[PDB]
Design an enzyme around this catalytic site. Structure first.
Site, PDB file in Angstrom:
ATOM      1  N   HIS C  85       0.814  -1.215   0.000  1.00  0.00           N
ATOM      2  CA  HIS C  85       0.000   0.000   0.000  1.00  0.00           C
ATOM      3  C   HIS C  85       0.845   1.261   0.000  1.00  0.00           C
ATOM      4  N   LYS C 114       4.043  -0.566  11.853  1.00  0.00           N
ATOM      5  CA  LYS C 114       4.974   0.329  12.527  1.00  0.00           C
ATOM      6  C   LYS C 114       5.132   1.630  11.762  1.00  0.00           C
ATOM      7  N   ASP C 119       3.904   7.494  10.323  1.00  0.00           N
ATOM      8  CA  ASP C 119       3.724   8.198   9.042  1.00  0.00           C
ATOM      9  C   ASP C 119       4.996   8.166   8.199  1.00  0.00           C
ATOM     10  N   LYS C 126      10.444  -7.821   5.853  1.00  0.00           N
ATOM     11  CA  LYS C 126      11.440  -8.270   6.807  1.00  0.00           C
ATOM     12  C   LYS C 126      12.101  -9.495   6.206  1.00  0.00           C
ATOM     13  N   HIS C 195      22.193   3.557  -4.359  1.00  0.00           N
ATOM     14  CA  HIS C 195      22.591   3.515  -2.961  1.00  0.00           C
ATOM     15  C   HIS C 195      21.421   3.674  -2.013  1.00  0.00           C
ATOM     16  N   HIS C 209      23.249  10.786   9.674  1.00  0.00           N
ATOM     17  CA  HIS C 209      23.690  11.021  11.044  1.00  0.00           C
ATOM     18  C   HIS C 209      22.825  10.254  12.044  1.00  0.00           C
ATOM     19  N   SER C 213      22.215   5.052  16.232  1.00  0.00           N
ATOM     20  CA  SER C 213      21.641   5.592  17.445  1.00  0.00           C
ATOM     21  C   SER C 213      20.172   5.944  17.314  1.00  0.00           C
ATOM     22  N   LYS C 387      17.761  11.310   1.953  1.00  0.00           N
ATOM     23  CA  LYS C 387      19.088  11.855   1.762  1.00  0.00           C
ATOM     24  C   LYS C 387      19.649  11.329   0.459  1.00  0.00           C
ATOM     25  N   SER C 393      23.730  17.032   0.866  1.00  0.00           N
ATOM     26  CA  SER C 393      23.769  17.060   2.322  1.00  0.00           C
ATOM     27  C   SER C 393      22.955  18.251   2.783  1.00  0.00           C
TER      28      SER C 393
HETATM   29  N1  LIG Z   1      16.954  -0.466  13.806  1.00  0.00           N
HETATM   30  C1  LIG Z   1      16.993  -1.563  14.610  1.00  0.00           C
HETATM   31  O1  LIG Z   1      18.061  -2.131  14.843  1.00  0.00           O
HETATM   32  C2  LIG Z   1      15.754  -1.908  15.163  1.00  0.00           C
HETATM   33  C3  LIG Z   1      15.676  -3.014  15.990  1.00  0.00           C
HETATM   34  N2  LIG Z   1      14.455  -3.343  16.611  1.00  0.00           N
HETATM   35  C4  LIG Z   1      14.249  -4.591  17.355  1.00  0.00           C
HETATM   36  O2  LIG Z   1      15.033  -4.541  18.540  1.00  0.00           O
HETATM   37  C5  LIG Z   1      15.550  -5.874  18.781  1.00  0.00           C
HETATM   38  C6  LIG Z   1      17.080  -5.962  18.564  1.00  0.00           C
HETATM   39  O3  LIG Z   1      17.509  -4.880  17.818  1.00  0.00           O
HETATM   40  P1  LIG Z   1      19.253  -4.956  17.788  1.00  0.00           P
HETATM   41  O4  LIG Z   1      19.635  -4.166  19.018  1.00  0.00           O
HETATM   42  O5  LIG Z   1      19.432  -4.384  16.437  1.00  0.00           O
HETATM   43  O6  LIG Z   1      19.641  -6.498  17.888  1.00  0.00           O
HETATM   44  P2  LIG Z   1      21.300  -6.672  18.128  1.00  0.00           P
HETATM   45  O7  LIG Z   1      21.752  -7.633  17.074  1.00  0.00           O
HETATM   46  O8  LIG Z   1      21.847  -5.285  18.142  1.00  0.00           O
HETATM   47  O9  LIG Z   1      21.583  -7.420  19.580  1.00  0.00           O
HETATM   48  C7  LIG Z   1      20.518  -7.084  20.441  1.00  0.00           C
HETATM   49  C8  LIG Z   1      20.841  -7.544  21.930  1.00  0.00           C
HETATM   50  O10 LIG Z   1      19.938  -8.554  22.360  1.00  0.00           O
HETATM   51  C9  LIG Z   1      20.684  -9.498  23.099  1.00  0.00           C
HETATM   52  N3  LIG Z   1      19.910 -10.729  23.040  1.00  0.00           N
HETATM   53  C10 LIG Z   1      19.546 -11.465  21.914  1.00  0.00           C
HETATM   54  N4  LIG Z   1      18.780 -12.543  22.187  1.00  0.00           N
HETATM   55  C11 LIG Z   1      18.628 -12.491  23.581  1.00  0.00           C
HETATM   56  C12 LIG Z   1      17.947 -13.331  24.498  1.00  0.00           C
HETATM   57  N5  LIG Z   1      17.243 -14.459  24.071  1.00  0.00           N
HETATM   58  N6  LIG Z   1      17.948 -13.060  25.839  1.00  0.00           N
HETATM   59  C13 LIG Z   1      18.648 -11.937  26.209  1.00  0.00           C
HETATM   60  N7  LIG Z   1      19.344 -11.057  25.484  1.00  0.00           N
HETATM   61  C14 LIG Z   1      19.323 -11.361  24.128  1.00  0.00           C
HETATM   62  C15 LIG Z   1      22.024  -9.585  22.386  1.00  0.00           C
HETATM   63  O11 LIG Z   1      22.874 -10.124  23.216  1.00  0.00           O
HETATM   64  P3  LIG Z   1      23.694 -11.603  22.530  1.00  0.00           P
HETATM   65  O12 LIG Z   1      24.777 -10.888  21.783  1.00  0.00           O
HETATM   66  O13 LIG Z   1      24.086 -12.365  23.802  1.00  0.00           O
HETATM   67  O14 LIG Z   1      22.525 -12.122  21.743  1.00  0.00           O
HETATM   68  C16 LIG Z   1      22.282  -8.080  22.130  1.00  0.00           C
HETATM   69  O15 LIG Z   1      22.851  -7.509  23.283  1.00  0.00           O
HETATM   70  C17 LIG Z   1      14.868  -6.791  17.729  1.00  0.00           C
HETATM   71  O16 LIG Z   1      13.605  -7.123  18.188  1.00  0.00           O
HETATM   72  C18 LIG Z   1      14.772  -5.830  16.566  1.00  0.00           C
HETATM   73  O17 LIG Z   1      13.821  -6.217  15.650  1.00  0.00           O
HETATM   74  C19 LIG Z   1      13.414  -2.408  16.573  1.00  0.00           C
HETATM   75  C20 LIG Z   1      13.476  -1.325  15.769  1.00  0.00           C
HETATM   76  C21 LIG Z   1      14.617  -1.039  14.862  1.00  0.00           C
HETATM   77  N1  LIG Z   2      27.811   3.377  19.874  1.00  0.00           N
HETATM   78  C1  LIG Z   2      28.170   4.581  20.338  1.00  0.00           C
HETATM   79  N2  LIG Z   2      27.641   5.671  19.705  1.00  0.00           N
HETATM   80  C2  LIG Z   2      27.972   6.902  20.131  1.00  0.00           C
HETATM   81  C3  LIG Z   2      28.825   7.149  21.185  1.00  0.00           C
HETATM   82  N3  LIG Z   2      28.950   8.474  21.359  1.00  0.00           N
HETATM   83  C4  LIG Z   2      28.176   9.084  20.425  1.00  0.00           C
HETATM   84  N4  LIG Z   2      27.585   8.102  19.666  1.00  0.00           N
HETATM   85  C5  LIG Z   2      26.662   8.215  18.547  1.00  0.00           C
HETATM   86  O1  LIG Z   2      27.390   8.399  17.355  1.00  0.00           O
HETATM   87  C6  LIG Z   2      26.829   9.445  16.606  1.00  0.00           C
HETATM   88  C7  LIG Z   2      27.861  10.554  16.404  1.00  0.00           C
HETATM   89  O2  LIG Z   2      27.970  11.364  17.556  1.00  0.00           O
HETATM   90  P1  LIG Z   2      28.009  12.983  17.515  1.00  0.00           P
HETATM   91  O3  LIG Z   2      28.727  13.483  16.277  1.00  0.00           O
HETATM   92  O4  LIG Z   2      28.727  13.448  18.764  1.00  0.00           O
HETATM   93  O5  LIG Z   2      26.495  13.536  17.323  1.00  0.00           O
HETATM   94  P2  LIG Z   2      25.267  13.823  18.341  1.00  0.00           P
HETATM   95  O6  LIG Z   2      24.007  14.164  17.528  1.00  0.00           O
HETATM   96  O7  LIG Z   2      25.672  14.946  19.283  1.00  0.00           O
HETATM   97  O8  LIG Z   2      25.003  12.428  19.100  1.00  0.00           O
HETATM   98  P3  LIG Z   2      24.369  12.399  20.581  1.00  0.00           P
HETATM   99  O9  LIG Z   2      25.494  12.283  21.581  1.00  0.00           O
HETATM  100  O10 LIG Z   2      23.500  11.185  20.745  1.00  0.00           O
HETATM  101  O11 LIG Z   2      23.531  13.638  20.811  1.00  0.00           O
HETATM  102  C8  LIG Z   2      25.590   9.866  17.376  1.00  0.00           C
HETATM  103  O12 LIG Z   2      24.571   9.013  16.922  1.00  0.00           O
HETATM  104  C9  LIG Z   2      25.838   9.446  18.798  1.00  0.00           C
HETATM  105  O13 LIG Z   2      24.664   9.086  19.499  1.00  0.00           O
HETATM  106  C10 LIG Z   2      29.374   6.088  21.839  1.00  0.00           C
HETATM  107  O14 LIG Z   2      30.128   6.372  22.773  1.00  0.00           O
HETATM  108  N5  LIG Z   2      29.049   4.790  21.411  1.00  0.00           N
HETATM  109  N1  LIG Z   3      14.164  -3.741  11.792  1.00  0.00           N
HETATM  110  C1  LIG Z   3      13.873  -2.327  11.852  1.00  0.00           C
HETATM  111  C2  LIG Z   3      13.884  -1.728  10.456  1.00  0.00           C
HETATM  112  C3  LIG Z   3      14.243  -0.271  10.493  1.00  0.00           C
HETATM  113  C4  LIG Z   3      14.642   0.270   9.147  1.00  0.00           C
HETATM  114  O1  LIG Z   3      13.857   0.115   8.190  1.00  0.00           O
HETATM  115  O2  LIG Z   3      15.748   0.852   9.046  1.00  0.00           O
HETATM  116  C5  LIG Z   3      12.521  -2.058  12.540  1.00  0.00           C
HETATM  117  O3  LIG Z   3      11.931  -2.978  13.125  1.00  0.00           O
HETATM  118  O4  LIG Z   3      11.971  -0.937  12.536  1.00  0.00           O
HETATM  119 ZN   LIG Z   4      22.509  12.576  16.774  1.00  0.00          ZN
END
Ligand SMILES: NC(=O)C1=CN([C@@H]2O[C@H](COP(=O)(O)OP(=O)(O)OC[C@H]3O[C@@H](n4cnc5c(N)ncnc54)[C@H](OP(=O)(O)O)[C@@H]3O)[C@@H](O)[C@H]2O)C=CC1
Ligand SMILES: Nc1nc2c(ncn2[C@@H]2O[C@H](COP(=O)(O)OP(=O)(O)OP(=O)(O)O)[C@@H](O)[C@H]2O)c(=O)[nH]1
Ligand SMILES: N[C@@H](CCC(=O)O)C(=O)O
Ligand SMILES: [Zn+2]
Ligand SMILES: NC(=O)C1=CN([C@@H]2O[C@H](COP(=O)(O)OP(=O)(O)OC[C@H]3O[C@@H](n4cnc5c(N)ncnc54)[C@H](OP(=O)(O)O)[C@@H]3O)[C@@H](O)[C@H]2O)C=CC1
Ligand SMILES: NC(=O)C1=CN([C@@H]2O[C@H](COP(=O)(O)OP(=O)(O)OC[C@H]3O[C@@H](n4cnc5c(N)ncnc54)[C@H](OP(=O)(O)O)[C@@H]3O)[C@@H](O)[C@H]2O)C=CC1
Ligand SMILES: Nc1nc2c(ncn2[C@@H]2O[C@H](COP(=O)(O)OP(=O)(O)OP(=O)(O)O)[C@@H](O)[C@H]2O)c(=O)[nH]1
Ligand SMILES: Nc1nc2c(ncn2[C@@H]2O[C@H](COP(=O)(O)OP(=O)(O)OP(=O)(O)O)[C@@H](O)[C@H]2O)c(=O)[nH]1
Ligand SMILES: N[C@@H](CCC(=O)O)C(=O)O
Ligand SMILES: N[C@@H](CCC(=O)O)C(=O)O
Ligand SMILES: [Zn+2]
Ligand SMILES: [Zn+2]
Ligand SMILES: [Zn+2]
Ligand SMILES: [Zn+2]
Ligand SMILES: [Zn+2]
Lengths: 495, 495, 495
Positions: C85, C114, C119, C126, C195, C209, C213, C387, C393
């Site tokens: 859609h 989601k 919006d 997925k 890209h 950016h 995070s 972007k 940019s």
């Molecule tokens: N943009 C994104 O990344 C988005 C992610 N999400 C959702 O958030 C969740 C994870 O995202 P992400 O952070 O990217 O995943 P990651 O690959 O970054 O790892 C996520 C964390 O979950 C831990 N973990 C995994 N399985 C288990 C478990 N069974 N019990 C306890 N801890 C566990 C992992 O530890 P270990 O290394 O030990 O597994 C790791 O610390 C998923 O549901 C994803 O769909 C939602 C929105 C967007």
């Molecule tokens: N994984 C990780 N990400 C970080 C860390 N510090 C900053 N970042 C993220 O890396 C990106 C670059 O950081 P900055 O250039 O300082 O920009 P920012 O918008 O001020 O980021 P914020 O600190 O979240 O407000 C931002 O998404 C930050 O959140 C860190 O120590 N570890």
């Molecule tokens: N797995 C992410 C996808 C985010 C994205 O499209 O960058 C979520 O659940 O939202």
């Molecule tokens: Zn930021």
């Protein structure tokens, strides 16, 4: 195009590149945080720069043209694509008998780095057609630029998403209008962005304001950004501002004409102009409009009334700013020591040789490098491409909203003040300065091209100055530019 | 209709063109700086002018439909593209039995000149299907719309970068939705711009705000700009402003009704509305909303309570402003003498014939030409296309940022006013005007459609007016318009 | 894996969707204009909903990999696309051994709803690949994700206008950069938007950016938008704001880490972190930057100096906010009774089962639902896709012009005031505050990323709250979200 200081153009830029890459090689290794650090980082840096240097794709064409007398002539041509680290590739088309795969390879490598200096999101590319356009008729030229384009398109060497060209020596608006038309008409009829397949086009065919004068305007800005930094004007021993000083331009083309035009406007005094058949001179000044006027009616500048015909290298006029705006390798080992100017404004692409660079260096002459100084062109080009992708004349949808938002803004400050100082003030009108009145509808397309250019020229000047001082490059601004350029490109290959 | 002044639509608009083509002829000639001078230019000019007039491509369809009852019926349709001097082509799809290759041709051309008046970068185009929709079920009308889209798609007469169709008589959101759906479900499955293939869509399907009511709104803005101009209002013998004016409207469709809505809104009294089965009348006023209600309820405007059934040419009603918003060739030499209105607002496409144009001028009836008045349509269709292309709702990324900045800008005027008037001023709150508070987060989509349309319809009204006064066309507004459409198009064809 | 409440993920998500639908069924029916009133109004509604629930497409994959050791390995994988859609579909790629067609199906359905909530104009999709990434090499993880990209490319399950993937569990910047390349290397070689075929790319490779995070930064905003509504913290029995608050985070990946960063930045004390080999815990605070360094240096959290190995479900740690940021179906009917936290912020995808949702409901535990809470992702993904489309940019062309515009704007207030208050003021300077000094050039890219996200989350927060109250859902925030997602997707379904 000299004698005993005529290095291979490509290697001459590789020379510049290689220099600015040792200046950062330490920085790059320290940057890269790879877990297998060591010299296995020093070398994976060594590998990455080794991929950046050589053009990724070169296409050598031989294609026939029916001349106007009926005869067949096999016309030679090349476009080199230096890097794709950003697509699409960007770079001009040159019509000259100096065109060779190495010259065009070089101009190509020069163009990615030029776009890194000013953060224009294109990998470099260049094209040349080995012809001398004074020997050809417009109809022939058209027949050529079109057939050249059809060959480029079928092999993937032109296309808005893959490779976008632009003008250069002996090319311009006209040939840009041709390329655009033969591509859009054939390979990209369905392509919404077909007319973004090349920049430099006529305003009316998708081009942008000031593109013709763009490289020269950007030339004035690069000079201004140093002519006014007392830090360097000290090291030079001459005073800030344009109002003091005096200049001579090699070349009266798109670069030179407009370099003169602007420098003159802001106070500087053009004492000498030259082209491929001579040079004219007059320390009291040469008006760019009279000179241009005369040039247009007489096919040459020689015998301009209000100036003498100068016997002698214009490169060696007595002046403050020398602006090479002709072709490459014009300041060479043998004539650098006789230059008499303190600043070399590199309008042209690589007009000074590496070894002239070293003479200038120790002779305390400031060479402002092509890499930065003539990137007015790609900037306003990128703007033109961006104009095409966007399909809207900048300002169009928002003029009336901001003219509105701005009076309502201003009217907020008026009402607020009148709310408080009820009748002590009385009627406090709050109205635009003449200059805010101009700005009051938001940036027009013309607005963006001037300011966006300035912004770029001033900013890329800055990070050249910041980089020159961080590495004690002094007046060697060239390698400072290759440092920022090498820096940015490596970043893409890095991640 | 009209049997003694039924000129062939294409030749008629060709006429309007030719006319305006002559008055510029000397101007265009002297503009072009071609070296081969004298009259090789004048040929060059009517040479280019002779390519503009004819349509480049016209596509005739005959395709079968399986009707509801089960029979096979063959549907014919056409699409004409008039220019590619701007890519893509833009123009509506109309479903009537009057559709012929010729009226589709004239309509298309009209669209080219239209977009030139109004600085929309589209070449003109137009389709038609020779069916009376009323005589088909909704399911049939669907099959017809889809198969007709497949035919246009395969032969390349639709596509976001080729030819963006749009609404017209007896087509609306519904149909565009099917067009956009069969395009994007077949040929366009990969196109990131598959839904920019048509405009006039449901907002829920890629549409933009107020595209249904946009050509009506642009009608208003076009009338307003002149009706508020004392120069023409002297000559015409009427009061500036909408306050005292009465108007009648031929046709109660997309541009019919909404023209009534906006004109009624800013003070004009709608005394009469007509449709294909009769008119209604009441010089005390008809309310659009009540009438719209009654019409949607009873499929007919006739028998509307608060207005009598008017026997006779509604075109000839006593009124200030006569607004044809139906089909073409309705005000002709037959009924031009007895029109009664002092301003003809051509909301419809080519609704007054040149013979009528003549009477109207020496009668000193002012004709706002369709060329400029109903462009409110493409202008918003251009906005819709741009919306699709950008894949963002206008404002989405900047609302909060602009909200915050204006607030801190406002705050800076405050903190600076208090920094001076320590406490004799006190605390000086600088607050947004109620209207700058509506305008505080920046322009939303709606804001762009409303304001962008207003800017457009005036910037174009001015350069029409300026060109009327430069060539002393007086009240021949159409001829100034084509003079501007030509001038802008000609600039493309030579430069 | 809970051995007594492991609903099939897809059906489980169908339950949430079913739930919300019967709430707005009466609503969708009444709005629906349909001439054919009655319950053939109700049944079209329920038929449309019957279309929305199932995924439109699912690609199951088997492709061989030759391992680093030279043996042959059959890698299975899936991509489901749930709704078109809006094109393109969006959704992450997941590397896990849990990845089944039904899990992938559920996650994709979760994506379309989601993006409806926030919006973001994307249908949902997925993909997973049934691998333990810990069990493969960087080289093997590249052969895999590159070949998966090729399998997805060749069957139309990746493309900048057809389906744009992105990160998810066990994928990230480094995998996105491969996808992007493999796509743009081959299929998309001519695509100007090659890209934009994937999001999550490194910043030098088209990324945006703070997209790493982005998601937890939205977890922060989404919590924040709820933790500051007195209506909800009353009902709860907690103080507004982050000031006194305490949270535990299951998962320390891209969602867990930055959720924990930003919450910590604005007050809250993180008291438990957990992953798949255990949890740590410290009521007096776990600094995120410390835990990162330790994690990065040790590849685990267990034994972090400044906390104790917690034994016992992190889901049952004593805290104000529980943040599941790992896999799905963590909070189930067995342990929901024992959760102790008052706000469950679902940063994960489907962490809470329906039976556990029920328990949470009647326990007066506010689960901020995945649907809305973790949509910080797609939103910033959306930003980067744009972007990539806009090939500029943010701010590049307008910084300088906006600077000068605001200075002349203020300068207008200055001189206007001085013109009134001649010398009773004297010199009335008007300058930017420090805060407007930072915005005085217009929004940078990060500006947009930061304010665009925040805007999106507050606005979406509100329309959930607005829905809940109108439907007297109280803490059933989830059903409020689905009700908006169903509302929004429906209404696209108009023919
Ligand atoms: N943009 C994104 O990344 C988005 C992610 N999400 C959702 O958030 C969740 C994870 O995202 P992400 O952070 O990217 O995943 P990651 O690959 O970054 O790892 C996520 C964390 O979950 C831990 N973990 C995994 N399985 C288990 C478990 N069974 N019990 C306890 N801890 C566990 C992992 O530890 P270990 O290394 O030990 O597994 C790791 O610390 C998923 O549901 C994803 O769909 C939602 C929105 C967007
Ligand atoms: N994984 C990780 N990400 C970080 C860390 N510090 C900053 N970042 C993220 O890396 C990106 C670059 O950081 P900055 O250039 O300082 O920009 P920012 O918008 O001020 O980021 P914020 O600190 O979240 O407000 C931002 O998404 C930050 O959140 C860190 O120590 N570890
Ligand atoms: N797995 C992410 C996808 C985010 C994205 O499209 O960058 C979520 O659940 O939202
Ligand atoms: Zn930021
Ligand atoms: N937008 C652009 O066009 C840009 C151009 N540049 C670079 O600047 C240089 C010039 O470009 P442009 O000015 O556009 O090219 P043009 O062909 O438009 O003008 C060329 C000028 O150089 C003169 N010239 C050429 N060779 C010599 C020579 N050996 N001795 C003296 N004068 C000579 C020509 O004189 P004659 O007519 O007598 O040959 C003419 O005056 C090129 O190197 C180009 O790469 C840089 C950035 C952008
Ligand atoms: N975006 C647009 O729609 C634009 C449209 N135009 C022009 O506007 C005109 C109308 O467009 P639109 O309003 O959309 O068409 P619609 O189908 O929307 O409605 C047209 C109305 O005109 C009536 N009508 C048609 N011919 C006659 C006639 N000879 N005598 C009396 N009433 C008549 C119809 O009555 P019934 O329903 O009884 O047949 C209907 O009420 C067309 O000529 C179109 O080209 C111009 C610019 C933009
Ligand atoms: N060759 C040449 N170019 C000119 C001349 N005057 C203006 N231009 C160029 O024409 C383009 C449009 O010029 P203008 O309409 O005057 O507007 P502009 O932006 O002020 O241009 P500049 O005068 O360069 O600052 C710009 O690129 C100008 O540089 C001229 O006398 N000779
Ligand atoms: N048929 C019809 N259309 C309407 C009516 N009111 C508004 N519209 C149009 O439908 C669209 C939705 O209206 P709004 O959301 O109120 O937008 P708007 O720009 O404030 O409405 P207007 O300024 O009157 O055009 C707009 O394009 C209106 O022009 C109405 O009463 N009847
Ligand atoms: N060829 C010019 C400009 C190239 C372009 O505009 O792409 C240069 O040397 O930079
Ligand atoms: N057909 C309409 C314009 C339709 C469109 O292109 O949006 C007209 O004649 O002006
Ligand atoms: Zn060939
Ligand atoms: Zn200019
Ligand atoms: Zn066919
Ligand atoms: Zn509106
Ligand atoms: Zn396969």
């Amino acid at each position: 195009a000299d004698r005993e200081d005529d290095p291979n153009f490509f290697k001459m830029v590789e020379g510049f590149f290689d220099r600015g890459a040792s200046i950062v090689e330490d920085k790059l290794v320290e940057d890269l945080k790879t877990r297998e650090t060591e010299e296995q980082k020093r070398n994976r840096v060594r590998g990455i720069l080794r991929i950046i240097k050589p053009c990724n794709h070169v296409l050598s064409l031989s294609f026939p043209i029916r001349r106007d007398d009926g005869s067949w002539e096999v016309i030679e041509g090349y476009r080199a694509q230096h890097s794709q680290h950003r697509t699409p590739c960007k770079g001009g088309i040159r019509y000259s008998t100096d065109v060779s795969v190495d010259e065009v390879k070089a101009l190509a490598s020069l163009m990615t780095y030029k776009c890194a200096v000013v953060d224009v999101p294109f990998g470099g590319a260049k094209a040349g057609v080995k012809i001398n356009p004074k020997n050809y008729t417009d109809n022939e030229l058209e027949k050529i630029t079109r057939r050249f384009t059809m060959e480029l398109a079928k092999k993937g060497f032109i296309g808005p998403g893959v490779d976008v060209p632009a003008p250069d020596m002996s090319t311009g608006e006209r040939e840009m209008s041709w390329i655009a038309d033969t591509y859009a008409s054939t390979i990209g009829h369905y392509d919404i962005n077909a007319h973004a397949c090349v920049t430099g086009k006529p305003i009316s065919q998708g081009g942008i304001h000031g593109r013709i004068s763009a490289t020269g305007r950007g030339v004035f800005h690069g000079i201004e950004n140093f002519i006014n930094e007392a830090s360097y004007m000290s090291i030079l021993g001459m005073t800030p501002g344009f109002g003091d000083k005096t200049f001579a331009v090699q070349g009266f083309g798109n670069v030179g004409l407009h370099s003169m035009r602007y420098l003159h406007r802001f106070g500087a005094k053009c004492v000498a102009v030259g082209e491929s058949d001579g040079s004219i001179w007059n320390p009291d000044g040469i008006d760019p409009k009279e000179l241009e006027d005369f040039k247009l009616q007489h096919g040459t500048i020689l015998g301009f009334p209000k100036a003498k015909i100068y016997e002698g290298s214009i490169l060696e006029v007595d002046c403050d700013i020398l602006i090479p705006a002709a072709s490459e390798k014009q300041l060479t080992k043998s004539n650098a020591p006789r230059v008499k100017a303190k600043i070399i404004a590199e309008g042209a692409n690589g007009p000074t040789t590496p070894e002239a660079d070293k003479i200038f260096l120790e002779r305390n002459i400031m060479v402002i490098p092509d890499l930065y100084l003539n990137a007015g062109g790609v900037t306003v080009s990128y703007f033109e491409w961006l104009k095409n992708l966007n399909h809207v004349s900048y300002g169009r949808l928002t003029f009336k909203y901001e003219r509105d938002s701005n009076y309502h803004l201003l009217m907020s400050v008026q009402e607020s003040l009148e709310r408080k100082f009820g009748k002590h003030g009385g009627t406090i009108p709050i109205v635009p300065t003449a200059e805010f009145q101009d700005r009051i509808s938001g940036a027009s397309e013309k607005d963006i091209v001037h300011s966006g250019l300035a912004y770029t020229m001033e900013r890329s000047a800055r990070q050249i100055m910041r980089t020159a001082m961080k590495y004690n490059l002094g007046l060697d601004l060239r390698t400072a530019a290759y440092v920022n350029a090498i820096e940015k490109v490596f970043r893409v290959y890095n991640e």
